[PDB]
Amino acid sequence: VRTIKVFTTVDNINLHTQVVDMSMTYGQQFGPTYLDGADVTKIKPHNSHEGKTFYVLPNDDTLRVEAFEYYHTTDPSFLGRYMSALNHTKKWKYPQVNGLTSIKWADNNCYLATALLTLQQIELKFNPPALQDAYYRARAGEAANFCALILAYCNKTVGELGDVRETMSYLFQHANLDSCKRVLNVVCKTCGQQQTTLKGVEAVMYMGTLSYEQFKKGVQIPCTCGKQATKYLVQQESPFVMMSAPPAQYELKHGTFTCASEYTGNYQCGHYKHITSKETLYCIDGALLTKSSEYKGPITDVFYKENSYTT
Numbered sequence: 001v002r003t004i005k006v007f008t009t010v011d012n013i014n015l016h017t018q019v020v021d022m023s024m025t026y027g028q029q030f031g032p033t034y035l036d037g038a039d040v041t042k043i044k045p046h047n048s049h050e051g052k053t054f055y056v057l058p059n060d061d062t063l064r065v066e067a068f069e070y071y072h073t074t075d076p077s078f079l080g081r082y083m084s085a086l087n088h089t090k091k092w093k094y095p096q097v098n099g100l101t102s103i104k105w106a107d108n109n110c111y112l113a114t115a116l117l118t119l120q121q122i123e124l125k126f127n128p129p130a131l132q133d134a135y136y137r138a139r140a141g142e143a144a145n146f147c148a149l150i151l152a153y154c155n156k157t158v159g160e161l162g163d164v165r166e167t168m169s170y171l172f173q174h175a176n177l178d179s180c181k182r183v184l185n186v187v188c189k190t191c192g193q194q195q196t197t198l199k200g201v202e203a204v205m206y207m208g209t210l211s212y213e214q215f216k217k218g219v220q221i222p223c224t225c226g227k228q229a230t231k232y233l234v235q236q237e238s239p240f241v242m243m244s245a246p247p248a249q250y251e252l253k254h255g256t257f258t259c260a261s262e263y264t265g266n267y268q269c270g271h272y273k274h275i276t277s278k279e280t281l282y283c284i285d286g287a288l289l290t291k292s293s294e295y296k297g298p299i300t301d302v303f304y305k306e307n308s309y310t311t
């Protein structure tokens with residue numbers, strides 16, 4: 001008898017009119033249902049709910065198409081993981097630190113803070129509208145949705161230990177890096193030499209050394225024959241490159257890199273900070289900011305600006 005009008009959605013843009021019985025739960029009428037992140041599946045409608053938007057799971061073909069077009073995923077648990085994260089990230093704080101949106105420390109989110117600070121310093125466009133829209137809001141300071149999306153895309157829950165390199169890998173997978181190209185040459189004294197071409201995400205990430213100059217000069221790797229072959233960078237076309245390695249004491253010089261991630265800890269427990277090279281070296285640690293003329297610390301990732309390099 002008693003009803004209210006509400007709207008359901010999967011993208012918070014296209015709304016679907018619903019009339020709900022106030023004597024049954026949302027779950028009985030829609031399946032799993034969320035109100036700005038809060039799980040209301042076992043709740044009966046409130047008068048204050050009239051006219052509000054609820055997220056639901058894509059349970060008919062219209063919602064399936066809308067969800068895929070917005071998120072570029074068909075993982076069945078995606079929307080519930082995104083809402084579950086959002087219920088936490090909407091209570092985090094996003095101070096502006098040295099002109100960049102950061103995140104006040106909470107819930108082991110230090111890896112997200114330094115990923116978010118890095119994105120704001122490299123040229124990158126996302127493909128899913130969900131990330132496009134949310135990143136735009138994050139840049140303006142309202143990063144809760146963007147953080148909850150990163151958690152959902154990376155299959156990490158709030159509180160879980162994250163790795164920055166992994167996280168950037170997922171984000172780059174959803175970015176337009178089609179123009180990026182890398183050419184490598186690997187030289188073995190017994191085996192000869194062999195050139196490789198990498199594209200897309202693989203053309204901007206390297207795991208083994210932090211130094212972009214070292215990568216151009218050559219780095220030693222196993223060869224199949226048993227000896228030490230040498231790999232060096234012969235050509236690069238991309239707006240940035242990311243150089244990563246297991247954390248090691250490393251010296252960062254002002255004006256020689258864009259930004260970097262520092263990791264202190266061990267494989268199951270640690271803390272990331274972000275170092276950015278501007279008019280001096282700034283260390284952003286969530287809401288905290290310090291500066292110094294030189295830097296040395298356990299660095300794990302270094303980002304460098306690029307455009308075209310040929311050897």
Ligand SMILES: [Cl-]
Pocket residue numbers: 008009010011012013014015066
């Ligand atoms: Cl929708």
Ligand SMILES: [Cl-]
Pocket residue numbers: 046048
């Ligand atoms: Cl109320």
Ligand SMILES: [Cl-]
Pocket residue numbers: 124125126131132135
């Ligand atoms: Cl974007």
Ligand SMILES: [Zn+2]
Pocket residue numbers: 188189190191223224225226227228229
């Ligand atoms: Zn060899």
